Design a protein around this nucleic acid. Structure first.
Lengths: 176, 426, 38
RNA sequence: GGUUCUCCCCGAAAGCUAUUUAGGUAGCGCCUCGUGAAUUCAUCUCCGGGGGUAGAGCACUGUUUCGGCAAGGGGGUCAUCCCGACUUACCAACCCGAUGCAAACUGCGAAUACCGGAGAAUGUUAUCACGGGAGACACACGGCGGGUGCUAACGUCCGUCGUGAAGAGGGAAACAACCCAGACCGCCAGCUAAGGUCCCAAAGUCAUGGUUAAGUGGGAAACGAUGUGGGAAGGCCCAGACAGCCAGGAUGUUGGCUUAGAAGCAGCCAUCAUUUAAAGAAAGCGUAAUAGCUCACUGGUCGAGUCGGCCUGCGCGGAAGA
RNA sequence: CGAUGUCGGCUCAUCACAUCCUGGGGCUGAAGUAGGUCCCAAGGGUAUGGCUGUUCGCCAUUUAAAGUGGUACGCGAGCUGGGUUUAGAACGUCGUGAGACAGUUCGGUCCCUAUCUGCCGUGGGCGCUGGAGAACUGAGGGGGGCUGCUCCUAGUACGAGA
RNA sequence: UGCUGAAAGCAUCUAAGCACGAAACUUGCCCCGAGAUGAGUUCUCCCUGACCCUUUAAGGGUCCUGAAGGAACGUUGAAGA
């Protein structure tokens, strides 16, 4: 793994503490600990976390690559937010934040609500799309996927999470 | 599965030379379809003064003359079928106990080897099931004699009821697949057909060249040979002409003389669009006495399925040798019984069908390309890219061929959808 | 999604993966080009 | 159908022929008992033989593919086959070269079997003849050689061997025919064969090296696959190696063919040429040619492996039954 | 062959899933209603009649649906005899005849007191470590498991309309 | 159908992790159910007298006392062969 051959650079504002196989991080965005590793060691002495195979399992290189990507993700999480630009368009499709509960009136007979988990914040400057901020990109990706799985983008409308003027491939069936 | 006797070895084509009643009998279209299927005969022998035998449909001396070739191949050509629930027709079916490859198989083999369309392939394989059914369902006698009739007791049904029921299950599953093919084809017809379709079908003497005609006339040509390819079989496709545009016809394969009627029952997949057609046009030269049984059969079919009140316009056949003169406008009455100057090679001339297709639709002025200085931005070049037809004749001031043509509903929608800022029309 | 026993690369955008124990193709261009079980 | 007490010794056959015969019987082969004979009989070595099986070969009998031009037709003007325009775009009948295929082909030809000699050693003379007494003539599986069948059958019919029949004991869970091995009797004895040593269930949680991660082991084929292990090579390369990417691509590259689209979805002349890292009358694709890559491509900050193919070990999917 | 009773129906069922309906998905020439195909799924449900003995088959009409197979082509010590399984008689055909028919027609005797296994219920003896009276915990086991129509959301989503 | 993600600097639902997902599975609902010999638990009630032979936790016989409770028997039941 040549991504595991590159340690992750840690700035002065991010504090890293290792407790055995458990990695705990500190930042301005928040304290977070999700991942504890199995066959990859971590240490640092020159402000760069190292990722190494322990023995000859022929897999700990790949696990060290995963650990490098995970630590890069949590460093960028504790300095900045991750996922924005969640758009879901439709006729009478509304969304307004209220605490950790968000409503999605998307053409259903019942109104539906999504309970946002701890460590996420959602804002919507306009009715049809919602912008998120989070320190865990796995959690914000699961939340954005759940909000996109409440109403799946059909090909005839052309919805989905798109950035600026980006086009979802639109089917042109039934053109009489 | 559907295994038959082995082929690929030379035999004769058995046909009675002198029936002394219909006569004519040129063999050219018959031998051309033998060529098209590729049925091979290295040496051709003719039976001089051979009247037909109504008793056994074959001669003993003729049979033992071909028997040297039968000792290699193992079959001969014996025609006819039409066996049904009487035991007399059971006797009629068993009457050809001799070594037989049927005319139905020899005719259907070309489309069977090279079947383009799917509905025609399903119908020709169920017709294959019918001609094995003629010798199987009506042919219970030989295994009844051989086996000793064990298994008939119990149910009151006939012998070999399991085999007949299994074949009936075959035709039920194939006809259900046919009905689902018909469902998806009618779904396609709902997508294509807009309230009318101007179709005919025309058959007769062979050697037409329908796909060569298609890629030659549609101004979109395919590299191909003059000999027959897998390009064949009757398909409804668009016809390029000088002036009208969208006409749709079948491209029918060359028709066989004098003994299709169960064969047109097999070919009812092609002939299904014949009945729903309003216009009825066909190309037959009237010098033939052999075609009189087929004329009577066509008239009986017309009396059966009705809709024969519209008179048929004439286009005459066998014009391919003379090419003697140009078309000339001669008017005696409104029926105009005049000759037809059709040529497959040169376009000139098709004037009577041009006159009919032009008299169907007229008023080619309603297109109006607006005269304004060119601007940049939205909604430009859409009317350029929309639709037009015909060819270009030299005119000034921008009266370019680009057309829209819709009925009264978009005649009403013309005043609603467009703001009409030009303020020229009132 | 086909369950054909011979899984092919139907187009250039098709990509094969091994998920759980089975092997399947995923296509980012044409949705009918994906299958299973080969 | 039944056929009644004991011990000891030997020990089959289910084949050939004939049969108003096919489930019976007669003769012979096989069994037992008794006389007689002889380096008689087996085995191994050496010696003398005949073969046409396996395999091969295509000269013959046939079959079969390709390449080498005519005596005459398919015929070429052919009522100019002109004793000269014929003599081709097929067989040049035949013949030559290469490649196959045969139970009823052999210009070749094994291993084995078989017959006959000489020699030792072993074998209760096993071998042969005659005489007394039978049984049997319904066979089965497995290996090998086949006919038939579908190179199906616990199918049928043969040759040969082994087993059961008529042979127990050990193993393969259970099992006549498979493997090991032929039980005179007794022992609370040792070694071993096939098979095995985690518990049932006796004996290695033995040692070394490797493989697989699927419960393979412990049901199954074509085919599909960056599963993984080994091997031998090839292309790129510190004239920066494979990735991903800001940016870059114009005047005959708008001549002809629904011409204010020929040019990217319909093909032929056609890329001579220019600011040839890059000039594209664009194929694979594409939304409404005017978003993008392989595009004949790269100055590139970016830096030690990368990409295909060949063979082989063990795996994965194809894989659904009451 | 020192007897394993032959179809169909009735009564009662049980299993496999190669799934008829209901359930969850993919793809679609899936705009919506409606379809086609493929994957997962056996929990439950899975017609009444006219015709002739029918399995079949035709048809009327219904239902969301009227599944395909195995269970001695399930089930005769559970039932039936409409048909072959007889003996009487007749027609057609064959046979100079007795007779025959993988043809037809009329008629034509179906026993069992349940020992064992198996089930459905129900008790007696003992055990449960002094003997009783009564409540329970729940290891196990069974039962149940279907679905139509109408209305609101809404004539909204979609569709040029219908 | 997915998120994050390397192996395989790109990608990827999976190998490490994680989140959805059906009348199928386990519970949920209703019955039998400690013969559940793995014979269970809780509350209550009742019995606290002697002598011989002893082949010994020993074990048998004699006199007295024989409780809590059960059984028997009659009257029977919308329980029952």
């Amino acid at each position: 793994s040549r991504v595991a051959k590159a340690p992750v650079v840690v700035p002065a504002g991010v504090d890293v503490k290792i407790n055995g196989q458990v990695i705990t991080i500190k930042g301005k965005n928040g304290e977070l600990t999700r991942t504890l590793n199995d066959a990859v060691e971590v240490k640092h002495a020159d402000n760069t976390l190292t990722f190494g195979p322990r023995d000859g399992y022929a897999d700990g290189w790949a696990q060290a690559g995963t650990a490098r990507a995970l630590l890069n993700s949590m460093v960028i999480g504790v300095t900045e937010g991750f996922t924005k630009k969640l758009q879901l368009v439709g006729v009478g499709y509304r969304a307004a934040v209220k605490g950790n509960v968000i409503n999605l009136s998307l053409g259903f007979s019942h109104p539906v609500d999504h309970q946002l988990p701890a460590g996420i914040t959602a804002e919507c400057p306009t009715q049809t799309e919602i912008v998120l901020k989070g320190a865990d990109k796995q959690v914000i990706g699961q939340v954005a996927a759940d909000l996109r799985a409440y109403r799946r983008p059909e090909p005839y409308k052309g919805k989905g999470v798109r950035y600026a003027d980006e086009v979802v491939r639109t089917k042109e069936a039934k053109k009489k | 599965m559907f295994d038959r006797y082995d082929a690929g070895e030379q035999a004769v084509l058995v046909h009675i030379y002198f029936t002394q009643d219909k006569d004519m009998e040129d063999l050219q279209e018959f031998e051309s379809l033998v060529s098209s299927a590729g049925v091979e005969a290295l040496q051709v022998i003719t039976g001089s003064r051979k009247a037909p035998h109504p008793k056994y449909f074959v001669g003993e001396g003729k049979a033992v003359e071909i028997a040297e070739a039968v000792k290699a191949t193992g079959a001969s050509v014996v025609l006819f079928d039409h066996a049904l629930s009487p035991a007399q027709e059971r006797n009629l079916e068993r009457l050809c106990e001799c070594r037989v490859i049927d005319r139905t198989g020899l005719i259907l083999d070309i489309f069977a080897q090279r079947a383009r369309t799917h509905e025609g392939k399903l119908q020709v394989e169920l017709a294959q099931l019918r001609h094995l059914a003629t010798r199987l369902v009506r042919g219970w006698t030989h295994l009844e004699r051989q086996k000793g009739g064990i298994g008939l007791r119990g149910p009151g049904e006939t012998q070999l009821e399991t085999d007949r029921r299994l074949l009936r299950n075959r035709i039920v599953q194939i006809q259900s697949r046919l009905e689902r093919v018909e469902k998806q084809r009618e779904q396609g017809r709902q997508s294509r057909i807009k309230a009318d379709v101007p179709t005919v079908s025309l058959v007769g003497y062979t050697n037409a060249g329908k796909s060569t005609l298609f890629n030659r006339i549609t101004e979109a040509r395919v590299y191909a040979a003059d000999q027959l390819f897998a390009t064949l079989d009757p398909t409804l496709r668009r016809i390029d002409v000088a002036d009208v545009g969208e006409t749709v016809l079948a491209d029918t394969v060359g028709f066989i003389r004098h003994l299709p009627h169960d064969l047109v029952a097999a070919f009812k997949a092609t002939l299904q669009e014949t009945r729903q057609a309003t216009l009825l046009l066909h190309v037959i030269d009237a010098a033939d006495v052999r075609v009189q049984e087929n004329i009577e059969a066509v008239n009986t079919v017309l009396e059966e399925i009705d809709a024969h009140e519209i008179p048929t316009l004439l286009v005459m056949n066998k014009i391919d040798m003379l090419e003697d003169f140009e078309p000339r406008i001669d008017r005696d009455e409104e029926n105009k019984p005049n000759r037809v100057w059709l040529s497959a090679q040169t376009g000139a001339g098709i004037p009577q069908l041009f006159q009919a297709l032009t008299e169907r639709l007229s008023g080619e002025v309603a297109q109006h390309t607006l005269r304004l200085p060119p601007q940049e931005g939205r909604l430009r070049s859409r009317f350029y890219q929309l639709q037009a037809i015909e060819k270009e004749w030299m005119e000034e001031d921008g009266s370019v061929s680009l057309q829209v043509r819709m009925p009264i509903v978009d005649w009403r929608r013309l005043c609603k959808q467009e703001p009409a800022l030009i303020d020229y029309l009132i | 999604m086909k369950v054909r026993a011979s899984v092919k690369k139907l187009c250039r955008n098709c990509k094969i993966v091994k998920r759980d124990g089975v092997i399947r193709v995923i296509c980012s261009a044409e949705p009918k080009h994906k299958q299973r079980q080969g």
